[PDB]
Design a protein around this ligand. Sequence first.
Ligand SMILES: CC(=O)N[C@H]1[C@H]([C@H](O)[C@H](O)CO)O[C@@](O[C@@H]2[C@@H](O)[C@H](O)O[C@H](CO)[C@@H]2O)(C(=O)O)C[C@@H]1O
Ligand SMILES: CC(=O)N[C@H]1[C@H]([C@H](O)[C@H](O)CO)O[C@@](O[C@@H]2[C@@H](O)[C@H](O)O[C@H](CO)[C@@H]2O)(C(=O)O)C[C@@H]1O
Ligand SMILES: *[C@@H]1O[C@H](CO)[C@@H](O[C@@H]2O[C@H](CO)[C@@H](O)[C@H](O)[C@H]2NC(C)=O)[C@H](O)[C@H]1NC(C)=O
Ligand SMILES: *[C@@H]1O[C@H](CO)[C@@H](O[C@@H]2O[C@H](CO)[C@@H](O)[C@H](O)[C@H]2NC(C)=O)[C@H](O)[C@H]1NC(C)=O
Ligand SMILES: *[C@@H]1O[C@H](CO)[C@@H](O[C@@H]2O[C@H](CO)[C@@H](O)[C@H](O)[C@H]2NC(C)=O)[C@H](O)[C@H]1NC(C)=O
Ligand code: SIA
Ligand code: NAG
Ligand code: NAG
Ligand code: NAG
Ligand code: NAG
Ligand code: NAG
Ligand code: NAG
Ligand code: NAG
Lengths: 489, 485, 484
Amino acid sequence: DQICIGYHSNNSTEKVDTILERNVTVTHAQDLLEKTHNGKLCKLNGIPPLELGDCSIAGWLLGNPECDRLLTVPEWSYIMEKENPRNGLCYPGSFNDYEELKHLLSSVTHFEKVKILPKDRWTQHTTTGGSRACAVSGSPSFFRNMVWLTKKGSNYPVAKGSYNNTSGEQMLVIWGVHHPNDEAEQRTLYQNVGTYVSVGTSTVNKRSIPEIATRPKVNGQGGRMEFSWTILDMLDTINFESTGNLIAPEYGFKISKRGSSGIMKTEGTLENCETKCQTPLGAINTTLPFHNIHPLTIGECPKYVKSEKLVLATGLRNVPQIEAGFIEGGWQGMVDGWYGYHHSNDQGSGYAADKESTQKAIDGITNKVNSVIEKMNTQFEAVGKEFSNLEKRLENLNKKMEDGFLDVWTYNAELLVLMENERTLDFHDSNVKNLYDKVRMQLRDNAKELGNGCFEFYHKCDDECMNSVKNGTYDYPKYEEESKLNRNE
Amino acid sequence: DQICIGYHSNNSTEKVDTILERNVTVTHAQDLLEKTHNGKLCKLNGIPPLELGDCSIAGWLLGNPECDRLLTVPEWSYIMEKENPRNGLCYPGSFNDYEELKHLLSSVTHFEKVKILPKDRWTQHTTTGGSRACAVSGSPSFFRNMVWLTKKGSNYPVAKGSYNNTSGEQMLVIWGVHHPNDEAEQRTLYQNVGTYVSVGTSTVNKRSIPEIATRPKVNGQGGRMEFSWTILDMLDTINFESTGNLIAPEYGFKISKRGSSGIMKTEGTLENCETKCQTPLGAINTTLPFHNIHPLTIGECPKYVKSEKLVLATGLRNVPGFIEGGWQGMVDGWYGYHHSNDQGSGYAADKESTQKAIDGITNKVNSVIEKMNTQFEAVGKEFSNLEKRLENLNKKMEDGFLDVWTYNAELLVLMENERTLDFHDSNVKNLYDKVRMQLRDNAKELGNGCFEFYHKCDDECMNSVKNGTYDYPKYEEESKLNRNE
Amino acid sequence: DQICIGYHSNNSTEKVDTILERNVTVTHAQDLLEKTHNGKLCKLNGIPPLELGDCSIAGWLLGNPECDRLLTVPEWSYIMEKENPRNGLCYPGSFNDYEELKHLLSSVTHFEKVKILPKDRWTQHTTTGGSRACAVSGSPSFFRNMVWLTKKGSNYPVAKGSYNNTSGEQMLVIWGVHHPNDEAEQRTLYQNVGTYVSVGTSTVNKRSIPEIATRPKVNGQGGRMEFSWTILDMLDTINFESTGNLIAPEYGFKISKRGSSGIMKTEGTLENCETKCQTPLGAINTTLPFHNIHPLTIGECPKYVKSEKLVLATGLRNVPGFIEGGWQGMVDGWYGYHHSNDQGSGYAADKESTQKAIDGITNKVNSVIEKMNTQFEAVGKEFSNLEKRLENLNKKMEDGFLDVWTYNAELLVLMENERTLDFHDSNVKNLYDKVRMQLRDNAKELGNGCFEFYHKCDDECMNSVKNGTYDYPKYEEESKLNRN
Ligand SMILES: CC(=O)N[C@H]1[C@H]([C@H](O)[C@H](O)CO)O[C@@](O[C@@H]2[C@@H](O)[C@H](O)O[C@H](CO)[C@@H]2O)(C(=O)O)C[C@@H]1O
Ligand SMILES: CC(=O)N[C@H]1[C@H]([C@H](O)[C@H](O)CO)O[C@@](O[C@@H]2[C@@H](O)[C@H](O)O[C@H](CO)[C@@H]2O)(C(=O)O)C[C@@H]1O
Ligand SMILES: *[C@@H]1O[C@H](CO)[C@@H](O[C@@H]2O[C@H](CO)[C@@H](O)[C@H](O)[C@H]2NC(C)=O)[C@H](O)[C@H]1NC(C)=O
Ligand SMILES: *[C@@H]1O[C@H](CO)[C@@H](O[C@@H]2O[C@H](CO)[C@@H](O)[C@H](O)[C@H]2NC(C)=O)[C@H](O)[C@H]1NC(C)=O
Ligand SMILES: *[C@@H]1O[C@H](CO)[C@@H](O[C@@H]2O[C@H](CO)[C@@H](O)[C@H](O)[C@H]2NC(C)=O)[C@H](O)[C@H]1NC(C)=O
Ligand SMILES: CC(=O)N[C@H]1[C@H]([C@H](O)[C@H](O)CO)O[C@@](O)(C(=O)O)C[C@@H]1O
Ligand SMILES: *[C@@H]1O[C@H](CO)[C@@H](O)[C@H](O)[C@H]1NC(C)=O
Ligand SMILES: *[C@@H]1O[C@H](CO)[C@@H](O)[C@H](O)[C@H]1NC(C)=O
Ligand SMILES: *[C@@H]1O[C@H](CO)[C@@H](O)[C@H](O)[C@H]1NC(C)=O
Ligand SMILES: *[C@@H]1O[C@H](CO)[C@@H](O)[C@H](O)[C@H]1NC(C)=O
Ligand SMILES: *[C@@H]1O[C@H](CO)[C@@H](O)[C@H](O)[C@H]1NC(C)=O
Ligand SMILES: *[C@@H]1O[C@H](CO)[C@@H](O)[C@H](O)[C@H]1NC(C)=O
Ligand SMILES: *[C@@H]1O[C@H](CO)[C@@H](O)[C@H](O)[C@H]1NC(C)=O
């Protein structure tokens, strides 16, 4: 007649980390970090992205002749753009407030091209101008969405054009101004000097003056074109007026759908998937609450931590018995619960595992795991932004902010996991010791402690007796006289 | 003749949170979060705020005809401004560097209007101009702080004006430039084309040419007015020169008091109170160190946490015999020494561990409060339509710091609660173990958390047993004889 | 024949902090914070810094006559600029994108001055103009690196100049425009009204018209000069064209070395040192992982925390059996195993738990130093008068991150110390429990922390118990014999 106290063990091999010990082998572990991706760019919830290819955003919106497959684009989930696109402004120039326009586009889904100023309304000027920088099949051409107004004969009459926005949504309009490289070019193209371009809306007032300068040749020309933009409100009017150097719009872009999107800098192409979220290096298909692939993601998928390992120990330490109690190790034969309650009566033995402590431990560990997951859902999420050449201070500020927040949250996650692992292992050891202490307490003094975490009963009992002791109903006054009689021997 | 060991219980109904357990009832608890406000917008240490009503800052500084109650304003503590004010720039136009001026005003109290260029000094131009955009009683009018200079007869001579800042402090000066909607209006108003407006200080140099375009009608007019500003230093002069299109100032604004203030975006009005801090939703009157009402506060009052519950467990687990529960009759302390002599009984606690635990828990509470008084404070700012990246950066920074500090506070509270509960349980267990050890073998452990004396003693002997002065070689012989029976 | 358990005590006076307790005396302590400096500005890795003295960066680049000691400058480690330099723009004016240029300079080591437009090529103008706002020995003078172009006789022909960047690296070029204070001065300098200044490169296009206005006399003159800059790429070209009001450059600044550097705001001078980290107050010479002198540092050196005390308790609580306190006689280890046989006595410690405790504590100390290596580093920046919101954003970001990391470090140290002390107490108690259990019932626990053997042992039994080889069946019958 003998019972003992122990704990479950098995043959697993996962390793966990703790604030004191390094690489401790445990029984069960839960993984929280995803470190794999399929390395493909592909669809988001069924809507394919917008593949610019070798074109830039400016070349798309202006109608570069090489970007002729984007003249009508369906709805998109995100925009794919290269780091150094080859096809942008075919005719050299600038694009004022380019990055603000990109920030606006980062949350704009489907466009809709509306002809606001048809090319045939300019009956007092010339509209067939073109440059060899934007050339198709050897002949000169121009942007497909803009009109280059030149003189007709020897006159450049005052050009006027107005549009009232009755489309039903906000409209994006882009105009431009030409800067020649001498006075002869100006007189050859517009037959006027001291010309101007004036644009006016309810919140816009501009009067540009051409700036003639001598410059090197970019794409073969010494002239430059400056492009500006505005967002026209519903039922608002826009007016154009110029005595020269006007690159007038023909189309206007109507914001149609709106939503959450972004601009991804990648060098890959489009394949066939259906993913939930996408990173510049690939697509993620996981249920784990963390990943470490790339800080910038689009869609619905987990948080980013700059760590190589995050494992939560949800079990016991793996120390077996080399070659019968908790002071040596765990038993392989326990396949019922965690905390061992090995018993051995006269007729036989058994390996019944306690349930009152097992369920309490399970509830505790599940609450701990859920809490660890839940306190980290208010993380910092990075949002992409573009900056110009004369905005290095602001770009450094943004980079430092994002990096600092990522570092803080990585530190938080790692430390929380380490401390929770320590507390879990200590808690399990304490639970084994507490069950042993409860057994010894209810036993009183009617058993000789063998020193291996259990005691041979000084009261000779039966299956009912040991079962009741397991239930916690060992009545000392019922079995004190006979036990004392045996102890007197 | 026996004694027992336990702890204290009562009938409180406070619930605290823990890492492994949630909603645990405790004896005593201390709240740290304030969640109530009076819903009123009212005074700050006896100084009323500046109520702009339906007016904007530009309307107040330029003297809109509808903001005529703010011509002379007393000292304030903060400013109330609506989200989309109605009476701003009556004549359509723009205000350059508006957000920078508002940032400057955010830390400026009382002004002092100084008449720097009197209207009568322009004896070569007409100063009676005005528009029906800013109309009072139907007739045209103009801004009350600015002068519209137009032609007199058929000339617009070169207009000059200088001021030397001998007022005694920095002064804010505002001027403007007019943009007509065609050339005919320009000749009808100024007689000249290709005009300019030039302003000169010791650090400002500007030459503005009017821009003529065709524009829709806003407030009935197709023209626009562009306004600019500068801060004049002491003993520094400002020069004005123009051949046309000049809207000259008549008043400068002297900075007089300075201090800590702000601009609060609210749509309410001013009531009668006297509070110590103000939020855009109402005042706060509390001595607790945290609040969760609004991130932007003006005054001296607690830190903001984006949570819903912050309760610190300062007592013991509330379960109604240290291996069986607690006692409802003990009112002395936390750690009990239930004592029962032959002729009497008692319920005295232990008065040495109680003060140690009180000191430890008080130090812990003060340390929790102390570690969190270096938090991050949000500061209001304004951004324009073409500054969306900067606005996004500011909002993300403020939100990130708020989330970080909320996480820190919640983790601290949970870990401290876990430690406190285990600390009290371990203290009770350690006291019982000390009693069992010092009693040696002269006791029969009943098992219910206390033993039965194997030596027969009295009230003084039992007091010595509890007092750490258990003299073993005193009464061990009769105890041995008794256990031998 | 008694054996007792205790922990070693000594005569140290280092105090540490904890969540529950304050000012607790410990045996051994590790300090992590460095709080002193030599208060000297001096060399970093053998390369001296660049000392502008009373000159600003603009004054250094433009060639202020007072900054004639900086005409040629060797390689440098950092730049020393006063908060309010006195010798900057001798002729009043402004510098466009000054802070961007300073940010660019912050990561730029040695410059190399290249003569890109000699002064004698302007054979149709006068190149000897100057002002009394930049005067040397009473006579008028001008910036050394710039040329002021004026009338030659009574004509001002169109000025043209070009440069093709064949130097080998990127180049910085600075030009200017002059704004007179009346029409008469413009005519007496240029014979042209409505002039322009045109600059064009492959990525830069500009045309500036002079602005004339009446202004207060700063430094004696009512005119102003506006200066602009650009970075010219390899094998690129810059063209200058102007009908008047042109301040042409004579030199360009080739970027020669590059590296990690910074601009430092101090009022001191250079002394004869050698250091590896430099803060604006002085140098740092340490092997510790933290410091609290100044947030902005140049070189390699520890992290900045805004605390005055970071001490880690690596030992046991210092109070003079474990149920009474420590032992001053023990010098063996940390956990004691006092034995005393009939023939003699002893003070031997335990060789098993001591190594485990040392390994764990060292692992934890190294971990604490490891988790703070991803800290936040401040980088200096400059902002203009119309950029107060950006300045406030930068200040708040830096201060918030510093506060967050300071909080992290202090909390980690406090929890570490509590865990260390509790761990030592638990280890002592568990060794005592192991001895008590393996001894079984063949002794009477004295009470102070040890037992009195019920059967007389010898030295062999003593070190057998110490080695965990006490055998109950080998000795129980005679033990029960002395039981009576
Ligand atoms: C209306 C128009 O596009 N006209 C020209 C165009 C412009 O005159 C301007 O130069 C824009 O670049 O220029 C194009 O042609 C030219 C060459 O054929 C000529 O040898 O050199 C010119 C410069 O001196 C100019 O480059 C051009 O885009 O190359 C074409 C078009 O006829
Ligand atoms: C010196 C002056 O204030 N002159 C006009 C003024 C300007 O002509 C300009 O329109 C600035 O508002 O405008 C006022 O006059 C006019 C109207 O009464 C009329 O119906 O429409 C005019 C424009 O076509 C002009 O606006 C005005 O704003 O009411 C007043 C004053 O006569
Ligand atoms: C742009 O179009 C809108 C609608 O087509 C015009 O708004 C109308 O203005 C007239 C004024 O004669 C009113 O009678 C209508 O009731 C308005 N319609 C709506 C829907 O508001 C607007 O005036 C046009 N813009 C301009 C500058 O004429
Ligand atoms: C503006 O007024 C101040 C004070 O009246 C002038 O400062 C004085 O300048 C004279 C030079 O003629 C000195 O002798 C005085 O000592 C100055 N006064 C003080 C208090 O310093 C200043 O010159 C005036 N500004 C202009 C442009 O004339
Ligand atoms: C600036 O100089 C470079 C070389 O020093 C010029 O590039 C050369 O251009 C000629 C054209 O006649 C080519 O034959 C050479 O092969 C080019 N050299 C190299 C290294 O590419 C460049 O053209 C010059 N800039 C200008 C505006 O002429
Ligand atoms: C070409 C030139 O530098 N000319 C003269 C300038 C200008 O006329 C303006 O004053 C600009 O300062 O001014 C001085 O008279 C002067 O005392 O500063 C010096 C010089 O004779
Ligand atoms: C561990 O035991 C499991 C029993 O489910 C078995 O499938 C697995 O192969 C074992 N692994 C090793 C390494 O013995
Ligand atoms: C486990 O961690 C220990 C650190 O004590 C390290 O020495 C060992 O290499 C690690 N194991 C593996 C497989 O990396
Ligand atoms: C994601 O992975 C699961 C495996 O858990 C798989 O069943 C599912 O098909 C995957 N989704 C896609 C879109 O491939
Ligand atoms: C207390 O919290 C628990 C969460 O474990 C929740 O189930 C229970 O409803 C809560 N009770 C009250 C009264 O809020
Ligand atoms: C704030 O509340 C306290 C209650 O403790 C009250 O005595 C005090 O009058 C209140 N303050 C005001 C301004 O009403
Ligand atoms: C140590 O800290 C305690 C705070 O508990 C303080 O009372 C005591 O004065 C301090 N001692 C010294 C020497 O600073
Ligand atoms: C730094 O301190 C050490 C002392 O550990 C000393 O040997 C060394 O010379 C010091 N460095 C300098 C540059 O003085």
